[PDB]
Design a protein around this ligand. Structure first.
Ligand SMILES: Nc1nc2c(ncn2[C@@H]2O[C@H](COP(=O)(O)OP(=O)(O)O)[C@@H](O)[C@H]2O)c(=O)[nH]1
Ligand SMILES: Nc1nc2c(ncn2[C@@H]2O[C@H](COP(=O)(O)OP(=O)(O)O)[C@@H](O)[C@H]2O)c(=O)[nH]1
Ligand code: ALF
Ligand code: ALF
Ligand SMILES: [Mg+2]
Ligand SMILES: [Mg+2]
Lengths: 417, 417
């Protein structure tokens, strides 16, 4: 048929995930490609940043690799994966190109090349779990992940990457090898060529400075960086110029090269082959073993099941995760404080205490623990704390009841007039 | 001679905070302004996005408000707060303009106007606590907070804003009133005037869609929005055009209007008075009471002390907070499970168990609890879990010791040949 985009991972309105297995099998399990070792290319990152648009230039290269003018006719619209302006997301879930490219590597290996376009993270219809699942799955599956960013590499960008890739790691078999392979920090609309040049060399210098870990660097800064180094075998950076305001703002813009700034085009022609030339095609490795298209379908199915289940922790926002953490820790301290004090009163090495006195002491101790809990400043504040405080009181009462039984076993009664 | 930027909040290299009290007092405690009700304007948001640049135009408006041509001579460079290109942060901590502007409000009140320029969030030398502190403090002190965004309002931006404002709330007196007043979402380089027009009306429609809370919207989406509605009295949005590639890109660019796109200038001229015209100047209110410059210095000192201490919870990244949350919860379940099983064996209502048998049962139960803990998938893995597992085992052992004493108190010994 006509080659086209195929929706492979579907994100439902209830935030669940479906894999189109029939469609996936039709593409990767064909007699022509199934036994071929696979190269998987993905682009991922914040929504509305020209991921699909870039991927469509990648397509022109994959088809027209032989011509020096692979970049295309200057009056020809850009087609393939769906891309457009407007502030609302276009690409959802994960889609792959229906035509698998067969390329000869400089070592004589004929390999299969798969292209993946992904739903941008942090759009306004998505839970953090949605964004994390999409990003993770694309990372786990691709051998080359193009991490698409706007203008700069900010600390929050590194943190998002850490979280999303951590979510991918959780769903994977444990290994001594790094989980993933090639990672590319593609910086769109890089504005400072006078400081770091456009392209890969300026990019590399820019990334080495930004990902640098040093002795006097605060641990929080060190850790997010070390995490990224530990995840990927090869990490690079490419600085791309702004493509011009027509591309950005013009509702009629169709993707014709005649409308794009020449400096952008010059760098794009460097970028794509740098990604996709035969010598650059990273064959997918899982657990240090090269994977075929057939094998990739089997891992895709297995990973998706894990994300469909409930074994993994839910990805959470900073506020939500910190508030929970603050409350859980405070409950533990408060309860433990109660336990220690009751031990001094009716531990096994302590005498029988009259039940009315034991009750008075318990009410006092419980109250001290509640005040202790109330007094700790936590995010989410008191409202968020409510179920935790009630949990604290409910758990202290369970302990008290256990203590009542211990104390009663020492009961002394003397009859006296 | 005279006026210039003054560093008021200093962030040290060890990530501690110092207030320049002498400098603050010299400006806000002067006889001319100390007893005046105060309007405090702040710009805050991601680093390297033109906050200081914008603020310098605010300065032009503040000085030249009377002239219709306040925006300035087209050949005049932009000065005041320090602004520049390059990928490394410029503004650190918080600085204020040395000259407090005295303006008559249309109701006859003469008020004092203060401008605050802030260190951008998420730079590569800052902990999350550094950024949260800067953002929170600027929000707590300002009556008008300009939230500076690039291109769009993404879900992560709303999450950052929720966290930072929560960090501010934690340091403030309990109140029934909303903690803050005016918040402005200023979107720089808005790319879709064909969808939502440049300026406040387009901004307003875009923001009402983006901050909208509905019945069928996932709770995670609802909650970050409700939090924002709850924090601020008046929330608005302004969509600003790209100022042109020269402004973004030219190392020689000086802030001269002749180098700036006319549509940007057209919109800038609307934006500033919309923020700062006499009718718009929001008097700072804390706990529903209007504040003078004298009072503002006092709240500034009081809030900063809280951030210098350790009563507040530490802001943490998604991974760090979620990983801690996962581990704390798993320890409580695992420990609670051990406790319940031991109760069935040596609760107060249970007969004496020979210590060798009690020991065997304890080792079995502890082991079941450890496996339960190890079986729960957590961010990020065993590495992060190590201290928690050790805490779990160590806490179970404490419990066991309490049970040994309970059991010994029921000891039965019979002498027999
Ligand atoms: N500012 C800017 N806009 C771009 C660039 N590349 C593409 N665009 C525009 O970005 C918008 C969104 O493109 P799209 O590929 O659908 O974004 P996606 O959501 O990441 O897949 C379109 O209007 C493109 O014309 C770029 O490098 N810089
Ligand atoms: N793309 C873009 N660049 C801007 C805008 N305003 C200022 N700039 C440029 O942004 C850079 C950083 O300016 P600065 O005010 O120091 O950023 P800040 O660190 O957020 O305070 C300078 O190169 C300005 O020329 C804008 O609206 N859009
Ligand atoms: F906003 Al998108 F693909 F990330 F349309
Ligand atoms: F990067 Al800035 F003020 F945010 F210099
Ligand atoms: Mg897309
Ligand atoms: Mg600045």
């Amino acid at each position: 048929k006509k080659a086209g985009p195929v929706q492979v991972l579907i994100v439902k309105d209830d935030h669940s995930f479906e894999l189109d297995e029939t469609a996936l099998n039709r593409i990767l399990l064909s007699e022509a490609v199934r036994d071929k070792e696979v190269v998987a290319v993905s682009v991922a990152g914040a929504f509305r940043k020209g991921k699909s648009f870039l991927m469509d230039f990648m397509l022109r290269y994959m088809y027209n690799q032989e011509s020096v003018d692979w970049v295309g006719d200057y009056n020809e619209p850009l087609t393939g994966f769906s891309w457009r302006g407007g502030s609302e997301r276009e690409t959802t879930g994960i889609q792959i190109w229906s035509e698998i490219f067969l390329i000869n590597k400089p070592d004589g290996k004929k390999v299969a090349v798969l292209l993946m376009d992904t739903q941008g993270t942090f759009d306004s219809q998505s839970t953090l779990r949605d964004s994390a699942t999409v990003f993770a799955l694309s990372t786990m599956i691709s051998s080359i992940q193009v991490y698409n960013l706007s203008q700069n590499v900010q600390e929050d960008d590194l943190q998002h990457l850490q979280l999303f890739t951590e979510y991918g790691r959780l769903a994977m078999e444990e290994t001594f090898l790094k989980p993933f392979q090639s990672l590319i920090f593609l910086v769109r609309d890089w504005s400072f060529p006078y400081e770091f040049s456009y392209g890969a060399d300026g990019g590399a210098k820019f990334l080495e400075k930004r990902l640098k870990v040093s002795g006097n660097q605060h641990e929080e800064l060190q850790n997010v960086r070390k995490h990224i180094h530990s995840c990927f075998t090869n990490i690079s950076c490419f600085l791309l110029p702004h493509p011009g305001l027509k591309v950005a703002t013009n509702p009629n813009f169709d993707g014709k090269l005649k409308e794009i700034d020449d400096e952008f085009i010059k760098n794009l022609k460097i970028l794509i082959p740098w990604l996709l030339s035969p010598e650059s095609l990273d064959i997918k490795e899982i657990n240090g073993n090269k994977i075929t298209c057939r094998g990739l379908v089997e891992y895709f199915k297995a990973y998706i099941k894990i994300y469909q289940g409930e074994e993994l922790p839910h990805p959470k926002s900073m506020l939500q995760a910190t508030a929970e953490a603050n409350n859980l820790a405070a409950v533990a301290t408060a309860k433990d404080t109660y336990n220690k004090k009751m031990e001094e009163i009716c531990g096994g090495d302590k005498p029988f205490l009259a039940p009315n006195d034991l009750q008075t002491k318990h009410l006092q101790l419980k109250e001290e623990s509640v005040k202790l809990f109330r007094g700790v400043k936590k995010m989410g504040g008191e409202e968020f704390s409510r179920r935790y405080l009630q949990q604290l009181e409910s758990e202290i009462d369970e302990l008290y009841i256990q203590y009542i039984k211990h104390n009663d076993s020492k009961t002394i009664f003397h009859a006296a007039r």
